[PDB]
From a paper:
In this work, we demonstrate these properties using a 9°N DNA polymerase. We show that 3′-esterified dNTP can be incorporated into a template-primer DNA by using MS analysis and X-ray crystallography to validate reaction intermediates and products. We further used structural analyses to examine the incorporation of 3′-NL into DNA.
Before protein crystallization, the incorporation reaction was performed at 4 °C for 16 h with annealed primer-template DNA, dNTP or 3′-NL, and 9°N-I in the presence of Ca2+ (see the Methods section). The DNA with incorporated dAMP is translocated back to the original state, and a divalent ion (Ca2+:1) is near the phosphodiester bond.
Residue numbers in the entry: 1 to 757
Write the structure that this text describes.
DNA sequence: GCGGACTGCTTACCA
DNA sequence: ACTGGTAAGCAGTCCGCG
DNA sequence: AAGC
C-alpha cells in the first residue's frame, strides 16, 4: 500500500521517496533513476542544437538541458512530434522553461508545471492505497487560553487530547484529578510528552478537525517560543505548512495528516460546521460546547478545570470517530484519482478530474494541454446556455409521476462522442451535430473523455456484480464507495469542460451537451402533452413532473410506464428516461421551489425556505408545519391557526433565541465586498476586534429590536443575552415567518396581513 | 419630498 | 474554487404623484 | 526548502 511520494536532493540530484505500508511494516523505497522533463514543439528539428545550448541560473548555478530525445505523441487526436527535454533537478524546469518558450525556434512547451513526486506516480503507473492494509490512526485536539485581541500564539496550549481505538487521554500542566487526565511539570514537557506518545504509538494517520489552520499552526508557534524540535515525521522531519488558495495545509512526512474539515465541507450541507453540529448530523448523539471565555475563567479560578478536560477528551474521541467514518471512502477516492489521500481529501472536483485525466493521458500517449495564462483565461470569461426550466403550473395537484433521464450529460458525451479531439475534425466520414450551437462531432474514432466515460460505466457494472457475489460486509462497503465515487467522477466531466482553468476546457463541448439536454427534455415534454394524455406540471434540466387531469393513481402509473416503453427505443445510445416515483399530491410554488407527498406520507421539499440555512428555524419550522397541513391533511384552516400561533408567540417574546439564528457564509476577502448586508456588517465588526474571517466562514447572527438597516442591529448569535438584548419580534414576524408561509398561502388567496396577529 | 417600485449585489439552493 | 438557472433579502436608487 |  503506497501512502505518498516526495523527493529529496543528494549532492544536487533528486531522489524519489515512496512511502508504503507492506505486510504490517512501514517502509521508504528510494529511486535515484527518475529524471524531470517537459516537452517542446519546434518550428524545425535542425534548431534543437540552439535550444540545447539555452541556459539559466538557479541559486547561482548554471542550468542547461541535460539531454533531448524526439518523441511521437497525440495532441487532441492528431499525431504530433515534440522534443522531451530532460534536466538534472526538477527545480531546473521553473528556472529555464520561460527562456526555452521565449526562444524563436520553439512554438510551445507542455507539461512543465507537473510536481515531480506526482510525475513519478503517473509515469511509473503507481496507484496509492492499493490492497487491504490495516492502518493505525491517532486523532488529536488542543485547548488554548484565548483573550480577545492577542496575536495567534500568545496564549499557551492548556491541554493536548488524543484518541485511538484503545484509549482517549488528555496531557495538561494543571492539577486536574481524573482517570484520563495526565498532569505534568510545564507546557514544554506537555508538548514533549505528546511527541513521545506519537513516537511510541507510531500512527500511519494523524486526524485533526481544522488542524490545517488552527491546531498545527499553534504547535509550530509554541515550539518556536519554547525552542522544541517538533519532529512528528517518520523520517524525523517537522510538519511543513503549504499554501492552498485562501487556506493553508499541514504535511507530516511518512504519516497522513487527515483534516476532516475540508472533507466534511465537500460532503455534507449543514447550517454550521462546528465539531458539535457535525457529530449530531453524522452519528445523531448530542455534544456539549465549552467556550474560550468560560475555558479561561475555569483555568485561572481552577474550579471548572475538570469540566474543560471532559470537553478536550470528547473532541479527540469524536474526531477519531469521524476519522474512522470518512477515511475509508477517501482512501477509495485516492485509488480512483491515483493521487495521495492527503492531496485528494483537500482537492475540489476540478483538480480531481484533472489528475485523473493526466494519468489516463500518459497511458494513451496523449500530450496534455497547458493551464491557460491570464490572456487565455480572459478569453474564456463568457458563459453559455444551460438547462431548460419550464415555468410550473402553480398550485395543488393530484396523482403526479416524476420521470427523469439517467446520467443525461454523461449519456450525451458518450452517445454523441462530445470531445475536443472530435470537434470539427477534418474529413470525418460520419458526424453528430449539436441542435442550436451547430458543433460537428466526429463518430469515426472514439474521443478521449467519451472513451474514459465508457470505461467508467463498464467498470461500475463489474463492481455492482462483485457486490452481489461477496459475503464480507466490509469489502461490500468498500466496493459501494468505489462505484458511488465512479458515478460522481462521471457526472463531473460536463462541468470540467466548462471550467475556464481546465486543461481540457472546451466551451463548444459544454455548449453542445446542454443544447442536446434541452433538445431531449423539450422533445419528451412535447411528446408527453401532444401524443399522450399528460399535462407537464414542472420540468427542470433532466426531469419532469406530469399528471393526466381526469385520471386516477393506477391509470397515471400505467400510462407513464407505457410512455417509457414507447420513448426509450426512439432515444439514441444510452439516453434512457426512467420512472423515479409517484406522488399523491404536489405543490408547485415557483421555479426550483415545490413539495410532493408519496403514498407512504413522506413529504419531499425542494428549494423552499425549509432547506435554506439563511432563514431562521422559526420561519422554516412554521413553513414545514404549514406545508404538512396542506400536503398531508387537507386543512388550509389548520395552516392559518399555525401562522397566527407562531406570530403571537414572537409578539410576547416567548420563542427561544436558538430558533432566531440566521446563517450566511462569507465567500470572499472582506475588502472585496461592494454591498454590506447583515452577515458582512457582523463579519467586519468581528474582524475589527481581531477575529480570523476566512472565505468559507459561516456568520450566525440575530436581529435586535430597533428601526433602520438590519445590519445595524445584527449581533453574533454567541453574544445575544436576554437580560440586556431584546430580539426584533416585528422583524421575525414580517421579514422571516409571514413571507415564508405567504409563498404557500398566496395560492389560496390569503393576504400577508390576514395571516398575522 | 414621499413612499413604493425597481435593481444590483449576494446567497444558497436545483439539476 | 465543476457548470448554468433561479428566487429572494437587503440596501441603495428611481420614479410616479396631481 | 520553507512561509508570504
Ligand atoms: Ca422528486
Ligand atoms: Ca435508449
Amino acid at each position: 500500500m503506497i501512502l505518498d511520494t516526495d523527493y529529496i536532493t543528494e549532492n544536487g540530484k533528486p531522489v524519489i521517496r515512496v512511502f508504503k505500508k507492506e505486510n504490517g511494516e512501514f517502509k521508504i523505497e528510494y529511486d535515484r533513476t527518475f529524471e524531470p522533463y517537459f516537452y517542446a514543439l519546434l518550428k524545425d528539428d535542425s534548431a534543437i542544437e540552439d535550444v540545447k545550448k539555452v541556459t539559466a541560473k538557479r541559486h547561482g548555478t548554471v542550468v542547461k538541458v541535460k539531454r533531448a530525445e524526439k518523441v511521437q505523441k497525440k495532441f487532441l487526436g492528431r499525431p504530433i512530434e515534440v522534443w522531451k527535454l530532460y534536466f538534472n533537478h526538477p527545480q531546473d524546469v521553473p528556472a529555464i522553461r520561460d527562456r526555452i518558450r521565449a526562444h524563436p525556434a520553439v512554438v510551445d512547451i507542455y507539461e512543465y508545471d507537473i510536481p515531480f513526486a506526482k510525475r513519478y506516480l503517473i509515469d511509473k503507473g503507481l496507484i496509492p492505497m492499493e490492497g487491504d492494509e490495516e492502518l493505525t490512526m491517532l486523532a488529536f485536539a488542543i485547548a488554548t487560553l484565548y483573550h480577545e485581541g492577542e496575536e495567534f500564539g500568545t496564549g499557551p496550549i492548556l491541554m493536548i487530547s488524543y484518541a485511538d481505538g484503545s484509549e482517549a487521554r488528555v496531557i495538561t500542566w494543571k492539577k486536574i484529578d481524573l482517570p484520563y487526565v495526565d498532569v505534568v511539570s510545564t507546557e514544554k514537557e506537555m508538548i514533549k510528552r505528546f511527541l513521545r506518545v506519537v513516537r511510541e504509538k507510531d500512527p500511519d494517520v494523524l486526524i485533526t478537525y481544522n488542524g490545517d489552520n488552527f491546531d498545527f499552526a499553534y504547535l509550530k508557534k509554541r515550539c518556536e517560543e519554547l525552542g522544541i524540535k517538533f519532529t512528528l515525521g517518520r523520517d524525523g522531519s517537522e510538519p511543513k505548512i503549504q499554501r492552498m488558495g485562501d487556506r493553508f495545509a499541514v504535511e507530516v512526512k511518512g504519516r497522513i495528516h487527515f483534516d476532516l474539515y475540508p472533507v466534511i465541507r465537500r460532503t455534507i450541507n449543514l447550517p454550521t460546521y462546528t465539531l458539535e453540529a457535525v457529530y449530531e448530523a453524522v452519528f445523531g448523539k448530542p455534544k456539549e460546547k465549552v467556550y474560550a471565555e468560560e475555558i479561561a475563567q475555569a483555568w485561572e479560578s481552577g474550579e471548572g478545570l475538570e469540566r474543560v478536560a471532559r470537553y478536550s477528551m470528547e473532541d479527540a474521541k469524536v474526531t477519531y470517530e469521524l476519522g474512522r467514518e470518512f477515511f475509508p471512502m477517501e482512501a477509495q477516492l485516492s485509488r480512483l484519482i491515483g493521487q495521495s489521500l492527503w492531496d485528494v481529501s483537500r482537492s475540489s472536483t476540478g483538480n480531481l478530474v484533472e489528475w485523473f485525466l493526466l494519468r489516463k493521458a500518459y497511458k494513451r500517449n496523449e500530450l496534455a494541454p497547458n493551464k491557460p495564462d491570464e490572456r487565455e483565461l480572459a478569453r474564456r470569461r463568457g458563459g453559455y446556455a444551460g438547462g431548460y426550466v419550464k415555468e410550473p403550473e402553480r398550485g395543488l395537484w393530484d396523482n403526479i409521476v416524476y420521470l427523469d433521464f439517467r446520467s443525461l450529460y454523461p449519456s450525451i458525451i458518450i452517445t454523441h462522442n462530445v470531445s475536443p479531439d472530435t470537434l470539427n475534425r477534418e474529413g470525418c466520414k460520419e458526424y453528430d451535430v449539436a441542435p442550436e450551437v451547430g458543433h460537428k462531432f466526429c463518430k469515426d474514432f472514439p474521443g478521449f473523455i467519451p472513451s474514459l466515460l465508457g470505461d467508467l460505466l463498464e467498470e461500475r457494472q463489474k463492481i455492482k456484480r462483485k457486490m452481489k457475489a461477496t459475503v464480507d460486509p466490509l469489502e461490500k462497503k468498500l466496493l459501494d464507495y468505489r462505484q458511488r465515487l465512479i458515478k460522481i467522477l462521471a457526472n463531473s466531466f460536463y462541468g470540467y469542460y466548462g471550467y475556464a482553468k481546465a486543461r481540457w476546457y472546451c466551451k463548444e463541448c459544454a455548449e453542445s451537451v446542454t443544447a442536446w439536454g434541452r433538445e431531449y427534455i423539450e422533445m419528451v415534454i412535447r411528446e408527453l402533452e401532444e401524443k399522450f394524455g399528460f399535462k407537464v406540471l414542472y420540468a427542470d434540466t433532466d426531469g419532469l413532473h406530469a399528471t393526466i387531469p381526469g385520471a386516477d393513481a393506477e391509470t397515471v402509473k400505467k400510462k407513464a410506464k407505457e410512455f417509457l416503453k414507447y420513448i426509450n427505443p426512439k432515444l439514441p445510445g444510452l439516453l434512457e428516461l426512467e420512472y423515479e416515483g409517484f406522488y399523491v399530491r404536489g405543490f408547485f410554488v415557483t421555479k426550483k421551489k415545490y413539495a410532493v407527498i408519496d403514498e407512504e406520507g413522506k413529504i419531499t421539499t425542494r428549494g423552499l425556505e425549509i432547506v435554506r440555512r439563511d432563514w431562521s428555524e422559526i420561519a422554516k419550522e412554521t413553513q414545514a408545519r404549514v406545508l404538512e397541513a396542506i400536503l398531508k391533511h387537507g386543512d388550509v384552516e389548520e395552516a392559518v391557526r399555525i401562522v397566527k400561533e407562531v406570530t403571537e408567540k414572537l409578539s410576547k417574546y416567548e420563542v427561544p433565541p436558538e430558533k432566531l439564528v440566521i446563517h450566511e457564509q462569507i465567500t470572499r476577502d472582506l475588502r472585496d465586498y461592494k454591498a454590506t448586508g447583515p452577515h458582512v456588517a457582523v463579519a467586519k465588526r468581528l474582524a475589527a476586534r481581531g477575529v480570523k474571517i476566512r472565505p468559507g466562514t459561516v456568520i450566525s447572527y440575530i436581529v435586535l429590536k430597533g428601526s433602520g438597516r438590519i445590519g445595524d442591529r445584527a449581533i453574533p448569535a454567541d453574544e445575544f443575552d436576554p437580560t440586556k438584548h431584546r430580539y426584533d419580534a416585528e422583524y421575525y414576524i414580517e421579514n422571516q415567518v409571514l413571507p415564508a408561509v405567504e409563498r404557500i398561502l398566496k395560492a389560496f388567496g390569503y393576504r400577508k396581513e390576514d395571516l398575522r396577529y
